[PDB]
Design a protein around this ligand. Sequence first.
Ligand SMILES: *[C@@H]1O[C@H](CO)[C@@H](O[C@@H]2O[C@H](CO)[C@@H](O)[C@H](O)[C@H]2NC(C)=O)[C@H](O)[C@H]1NC(C)=O
Ligand SMILES: *[C@@H]1O[C@H](CO)[C@@H](O[C@@H]2O[C@H](CO)[C@@H](O)[C@H](O)[C@H]2NC(C)=O)[C@H](O)[C@H]1NC(C)=O
Ligand SMILES: *[C@@H]1O[C@H](CO)[C@@H](O[C@@H]2O[C@H](CO)[C@@H](O)[C@H](O)[C@H]2NC(C)=O)[C@H](O)[C@H]1NC(C)=O
Ligand SMILES: *[C@@H]1O[C@H](CO)[C@@H](O[C@@H]2O[C@H](CO)[C@@H](O)[C@H](O)[C@H]2NC(C)=O)[C@H](O)[C@H]1NC(C)=O
Lengths: 388, 388
Amino acid sequence: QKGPVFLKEPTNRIDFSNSTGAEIECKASGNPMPEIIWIRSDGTAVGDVPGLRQISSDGKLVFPPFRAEDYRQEVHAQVYACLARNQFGSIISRDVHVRAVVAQYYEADVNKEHVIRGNSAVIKCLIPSFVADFVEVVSWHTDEEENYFPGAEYDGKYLVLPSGELHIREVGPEDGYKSYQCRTKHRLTGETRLSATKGRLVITEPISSSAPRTPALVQKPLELMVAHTISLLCPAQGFPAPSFRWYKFIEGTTRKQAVVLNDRVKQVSGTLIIKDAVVEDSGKYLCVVNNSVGGESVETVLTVTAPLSAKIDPPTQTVDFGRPAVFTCQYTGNPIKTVSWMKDGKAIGHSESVLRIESVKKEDKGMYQCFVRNDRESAEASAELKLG
Amino acid sequence: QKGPVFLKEPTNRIDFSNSTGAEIECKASGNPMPEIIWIRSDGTAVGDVPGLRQISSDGKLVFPPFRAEDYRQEVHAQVYACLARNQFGSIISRDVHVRAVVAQYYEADVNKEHVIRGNSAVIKCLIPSFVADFVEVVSWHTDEEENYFPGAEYDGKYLVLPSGELHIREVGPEDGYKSYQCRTKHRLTGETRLSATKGRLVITEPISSSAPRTPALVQKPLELMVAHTISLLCPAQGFPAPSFRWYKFIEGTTRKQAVVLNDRVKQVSGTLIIKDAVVEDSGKYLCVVNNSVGGESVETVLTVTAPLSAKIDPPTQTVDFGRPAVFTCQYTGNPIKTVSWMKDGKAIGHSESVLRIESVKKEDKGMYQCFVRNDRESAEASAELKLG
Ligand SMILES: *[C@@H]1O[C@H](CO)[C@@H](O[C@@H]2O[C@H](CO)[C@@H](O)[C@H](O)[C@H]2NC(C)=O)[C@H](O)[C@H]1NC(C)=O
Ligand SMILES: *[C@@H]1O[C@H](CO)[C@@H](O[C@@H]2O[C@H](CO)[C@@H](O)[C@H](O)[C@H]2NC(C)=O)[C@H](O)[C@H]1NC(C)=O
Ligand SMILES: *[C@@H]1O[C@H](CO)[C@@H](O[C@@H]2O[C@H](CO)[C@@H](O)[C@H](O)[C@H]2NC(C)=O)[C@H](O)[C@H]1NC(C)=O
Ligand SMILES: *[C@@H]1O[C@H](CO)[C@@H](O[C@@H]2O[C@H](CO)[C@@H](O)[C@H](O)[C@H]2NC(C)=O)[C@H](O)[C@H]1NC(C)=O
C-alpha cells in the first residue's frame, strides 16, 4: 500500500561525554512496515559492539557510557544514518554526526595584551582549537574583584562581547595594574573553570606617532546562527588613537556601502555588534581604521546560517508508462551548498531542485529523495512513484 | 635649453631613530638650473623648524638627531617630495615616507602552545603590532641551552622558519619539559633582546579522536619581496595527527592545482617553503588538512613584490601646432595599483600608460610625468614637450 516515510530522524549532531552516553532514534511508516537498518553515512551496515553501540527496539541506536580505555573511533567518531525499507523501496535519513568525547582536562589561558595608551584593548580567552567546539566564555574577573558578564557595558568602559572577549575603552596607565581571568564552561561535562593564567594590559606611552596597525592573524570566515547577536572585531593600535568605520561590500563587486547604525546594529569603538541576526546580514564586511598619520583596513566574511529543511512535491504520484514524472524539491535554510537526488538509497546524479523523468518505465517505480546540504548540516525529503 | 630631470631622488622610505637623524637628497638637471623645493607629497612647501628639519645646500633635507620631548608629528611622520622647477616647467619626485621613531622599550613574548601529542607545533614570538615593522626574530633558545638559527632543520625536528616561528615535528610528552625564548633585533636602534616571557608546549594526550581544527585567526594577505624565501604555515591540530596538502588557485576561477614540490619549493610538515621567490609565485594558496575523522582547509593570499620603476618614451619631443603628441610610460614592478599623469606638478586625470594629446597648442608645452604606485611604493618618469 505504501513506501517508507520518516516520522522521526536524529539531528545532525550528537555530541556527548563518555559518562553521558547517547541514544538516537529513527521511526518510519509504510505498509508493509519498513525495517529500520542503521548504516554509516557511506552506506555500510553497522552492528553491535559489546558495551559501546547497541541496536535497541522501538527504533534506537544506543551508545552506552564507557570508560576512556574503551574509546573506539569507528564507533565514537562516525557519521551514521538510518535506512528505512520495504518491498516498495528504501529511503535514507539525514546524516547523524556522532562525537563521543572522553572527559579530559583542558585549560584556557589569558596572555599579556600590548596596547598604546588611549586605544581600545581586547583581552582574549584562548581556548585550544581542539576543545573550542565545546568550551565557551561565561564571564571575566579581575584581581580587584570586578566581575563582568555578557549584556551591557560597565562604567562606560568594559564590555564582554558576544564572541567572548573583554573589550576595554580608552586604556590608561592605571589599567596596567589589573589582571584578568576568564571563566569557561564545557558543554559536554557541564563543568566550569577559571583560566590557568591571568593576563594584564601592558601599556606603551605614546612617544612617537604611528599609523594604525592590525595584527598579522585575522578572523577567518564566520558562520553564526540566525536570531543570535554577532560581534565583528577590528583590532588596531596606533597613535593618535584611531577611528573606525565599517562597510559592507555589494555582492560580486568591489563596491561597498557604509554600514547603517541603528537600534539593531551598533558600534562600540571598532567593534560592530549586530543583534537578532538575519540571513541578509551575510556578506563581506570591511573595517577601515584611520588616524592623522595613515590608515589600514581588514575584511571579514560573515555567513548567517539558518536550519536546512526540504519537502518534495508531490509526496506520491502515479503516472502511466511512457508519460513524464516531475518531482520538485522545495527547501529552506542557509547556506545551501548542494542539492542532490537519490532513488532507493542510490545517488542518481541529478543536482537541481526539479527532477524530471521524461517517459516513465517499470524500473522507475520506487522511492526518490532530495538531499540539501552544506558543510555543517543535511536535510532530506522523500517521495514515491507509482506506475499507472 | 631644457626642462628639469631628476638625477637623484630619495627612496620611498626613510626610517630612523631619534638618535640617528636622517638626510635625504634630491638633484635635478636643467637649463636654466632648476630650483629645488621640498614639499609635503600633497604639495604644500615645507620650511625650517629649528633643530628638527633643515634645508641643506647641495640638495639635502636634514632631520637632526633630537630628544624625545622634541618629537613633532608634522615633521617626523610625514610624506615628503622634491619639486624641481625652471621656466620650462616643474617635476615632482616619488613620495618620501619619513618615519622618525623615538628609541623606546619594547618586549616580545612567547606564550604556552597547546598541542596534541604527535602533531607538529609552531612556537611564535609575539611582537606588538606597533613595533613589528622594526623588530625581527634572530634566533630561538631553550632552557636546556639549545640554540636554533634560521637555515636548516636540527635533529630532524626543529626548524626556525623564514617567517620567524620555531617549527617542531612530532611533539612528544618529553617536549613539554622545555621552555623557549626568542631573541629579537630592532633595526633602528640595532639592539637585540630576549623575550620577556618564555613559552612551553602543553601536550594533550590523545584519548578521543578529532577532525583537524585550525585556529580562528589566520594569516592575512602577505606581501613579500622577490628573491627572498617565503614560508606559508598551516596550523592545525587533530587526532590522528593530520596530513597536509597545498594547492594554488587558478587565477579568477575556483579551480586549483596541487603545488609541485621540487628543489625550490619544499614542504616541512604542513609548512610550504618557497625559495628564491618570483612574482609568478603570487596568488591564492589553499592548505587542505586531513585525518581519518575529517578535514579542513584555509586560504592564504600571497603577493610577491618587485621594485617599481618607470620611463617615458620619448624623453623630449617637439611637435608642430595642431599635430598629435604621444608619451608612453614603460614600467616594471609588482603589484601596480595605479598609473597616473601630471603636467607641471598637477594631476591631469589620465590613468592609462599611453598619453595622447590629439592636437598640440601653446599651453600644452611643458613637463609631463607618469607615476606608478602601489600601497607601499611609487616611481615617476618625466618628459618634455617642445612646440615645433
Ligand atoms: C569517562 O572518562 C573519564 C576518564 O577520563 C572518567 O573520569 C575519571 O574517573 C576517574 C575515577 O572515577 C577519576 O578519578 C578521574 O578524576 C576522572 N577523570 C576525569 C577527567 O573526570 C569517567 O569515569 C568515565 N566515565 C565512565 C567510565 O562511565
Ligand atoms: C582612512 O584610511 C583608509 C586607508 O586604508 C583610506 O582609504 C584609502 O584611500 C586611498 C587614497 O584615496 C585609496 O587609494 C585606497 O583604495 C583606500 N582604501 C580603502 C580600503 O578604502 C582613507 O583615505 C583614509 N581617510 C583619510 C581621510 O585619510
Ligand atoms: C632619543 O630618545 C631617547 C629618549 O628615549 C634618548 O635615550 C634615553 O637617553 C637617556 C639619557 O641619555 C637614557 O638614560 C635613557 O636610558 C634613554 N632611553 C632609551 C630608551 O634609550 C636618546 O638620548 C635620544 N637621542 C638624542 C636626544 O639624541
Ligand atoms: C580531506 O579534507 C578535505 C576537507 O576539507 C576534503 O575535501 C572536501 O571534500 C568534500 C567531499 O568531496 C568536498 O565537497 C569539499 O568541497 C572538499 N573541500 C576542499 C577544500 O577541497 C577531502 O575529501 C578530504 N579527503 C578525504 C580522502 O577524505
